[PDB]
Each structure stands twice: as C-alpha cells, then as structure tokens.
C-alpha cells in the first residue's frame, strides 16, 4: 500500500534559467538574471559538469556579500537543468529543530532534493515529485500541533523506488540542494554532508556564505568560510561581486513588473539608491509598502514622496541596529 500525489514567497519568480547560453557566453539581458557575468559563466561550467557526469564527489560554494543574488544563481542553475528539476534552498540555521535532530533535518533536505518522474498511462502523463513528498504522504494544523519520518517508511520507499526504477516507468532526477549561510553548520553536520555526497543518486550540492575566515562550529580551529578542510578541497568556489547602479535599476524594474507595481523614473532612481547603500532586498521589500501606500491616497502610480514616506515608516537593518546599539552605549 503506497500512493502518490522559495516559490510560495515568490522572490525569484522572474528567474527562468541562467540566461548565458550561446555556448557558455553570458548575455547581459538574457532571461531574468542581470549582470554578474563571471558568476554566470562559472555556473554554466558547473552546469556542463552536472550534465555530463563529472561532478560526482564535488560540490559548489558561492561566496559574496548578502544581496548579490547567489540564491538567484542557484535557482537559475536548477531551472537550466530542466523544467522539472527539484530545488531545495534551506538555511544553515534550519537544521537545529525542536522535533528533528540534525540527522533527520539533513536527510529530509537531501531526500526532498531528489525528484522522480511518474509516467501514468490513461497518454503517459509525466508528474515530477520529490522523494520527501512521497515519504510525507505515507504518514490542517499539522504544521503546529512531530514530523519525524520513521525509518521503516524510508526503507520501504527506497525499495519501492528501486523496484519502480527496474520496472521501467519511473526515472530518478538528481535535483539541487542549496544551503544558505553554510558557516552556521557544525562539524558533525559537515561530516554528514561529506558522507552523503558519496552516493550514486546524490543531488548537486550548493553552499552559500558571506563570511570569511571563521571558527568551525564544534571545533576551535580557524578555517576559511567555516568549512572543514576535508570538504573544502572538493569545492568549486565562485564569487559574486556587488551590483552597480544600472544592474540594480534593472532588477528593480523586473521585480516591480513581477509584483504589479507602476513606479515613476525618479522613483526608480531613488529606490536604486536605496538598494545601493543599504541593500537591494530592502528596496524589494519597500516596493510593496510603497504600492500599499499609493492606493491609500487613491493613486495609480507610485511617486518619490511615497518612497520617502515608506522609508521613514519601515527601517532597514543597519539603521535599526545602530539606533539601539548607540542607545545602549548611552545607557
């Protein structure tokens, strides 16, 4: 007895493939992604590796200041591997759970990063489903009122998947598993990642970090990016440079078009400045508050004074922390 069946927030709905194409030649406009040409080219080389089969035993690391779209690059590579390539985008801090130990969290992520195609003759309808969905099927306030997937279900599901693979109607697609802020993982989890990568049906591993030489969590040694050496010489490291004015303008335009917002040109310039020295994602957050403000005064466009109101209402991270920090120093 066994039945079958990142985007919810929609912060990357404009991302449709990497966009380089032209035999590994980055296109400035391309499809969604803008700029960061070296990062696109390196991502394409890694894509070729994944395509042929020369990535086994290796993984990818993306290092750069936050707000440079490394998650966007991961989403693009996941898209360009195929329209039904699974993509998980967990964070390093998400493996510390009240109900699931690090083993269960990392295993759930890895199994959620592996897809299987289900052909179903009625015409063989193809339905792409991740393994973790199939596991959770075999088990409306469930998110509030355990989640520990039992071991026997997992072995039964693995045996079933092997049987359906040999039978010839299901095929396994390795997806992409993304770990944002990889420096927050500890040595006991880096060991699990090292051991799990040594498998035939292993998803591509992408880890993202924004911090340099840091102490490995669980040890007392300084290592680059907080990653143990045993995993650091099996890594392809790409770095994303900070955006410039025109690129941020283009991304803001794309996101406003995605979120149904009509903004004036000088408003675009002011929002680009916003994303210029505070953070681009802060401006992305500000667009929706500006849109909500503009409808209050019965307007169709968003003017610069709407941005100036919204910027005073909601604060970015640096201002908000400096306020309290200097208050505490004055306390």
């Amino acid at each position: 007895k066994v039945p079958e069946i990142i985007e919810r927030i929609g912060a990357h709905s404009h991302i449709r493939g990497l966009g380089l194409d032209d035999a590994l030649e980055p296109r400035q406009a391309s499809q969604g992604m803008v700029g960061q040409l070296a990062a696109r080219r390196a991502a394409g080389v890694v894509l070729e590796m994944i395509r042929e089969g020369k990535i086994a035993g290796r993984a990818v690391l993306i290092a750069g200041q936050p707000g440079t779209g490394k998650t966007a690059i991961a989403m693009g590579m996941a898209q360009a591997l195929g329209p039904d390539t699974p993509f998980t985008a967990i964070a390093g801090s998400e493996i510390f759970s009240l109900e699931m130990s690090k083993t269960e969290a990392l295993t759930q992520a890895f199994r959620r990063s592996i897809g299987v195609r289900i052909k179903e003759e009625t015409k063989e309808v193809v339905h792409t489903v991740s393994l973790h969905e199939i596991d959770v099927i075999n088990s409306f306030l469930a998110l509030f009122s355990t989640g520990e997937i039992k071991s026997e279900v997992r072995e039964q599901i693995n045996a079933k998947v092997a049987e359906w693979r040999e039978e010839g109607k299901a095929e396994i697609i390795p997806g992409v598993l993304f770990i944002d802020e990889v420096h927050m993982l500890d040595i006991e989890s880096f060991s699990f990642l090292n051991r799990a990568l040594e498998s035939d049906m292993a998803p591509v591993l992408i880890m993202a970090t924004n911090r340099g030489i840091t102490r490995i969590r669980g040890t007392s040694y300084q290592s680059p990016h907080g990653i143990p050496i045993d995993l650091l010489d099996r890594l392809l490291i790409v770095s994303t440079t900070p955006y410039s004015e025109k690129d941020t303008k283009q991304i803001l335009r794309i996101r406003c078009e995605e979120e149904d917002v009509e903004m004036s040109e000088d408003a675009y310039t002011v929002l680009t400045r916003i994303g210029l020295e505070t953070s681009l994602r802060y401006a992305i957050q500000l667009i929706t508050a500006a849109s909500l403000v503009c409808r209050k005064r019965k307007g169709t466009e968003v003017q610069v004074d709407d941005i100036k109101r919204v910027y005073s209402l909601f604060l970015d991270e640096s201002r908000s922390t400096q306020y309290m920090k200097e208050y505490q120093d004055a306390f």
Partner: peptide, 29 residues
C-alpha cells in the same frame, strides 16, 4: 542592538535574530 545569538556562543547579529528569520522581518522604530 548587535548581540550574540543565544545557542551559538559566537555568532553576533542585529537584535539576536538569525538572518534566516530576520530576512522576513520589517522593522518599525
């Protein structure tokens, strides 16, 4: 202001909120 996230013993952050949750947070002063 900036303070150590409890349970990590080393990582400092604004308001002691990990950047994975503080990402979805907009601040009123």
């Amino acid at each position: 202001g900036n303070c150590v996230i409890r349970g990590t013993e080393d990582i400092t952050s604004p308001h002691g909120i990990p950047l994975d949750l503080l990402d979805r947070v907009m601040i009123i002063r």
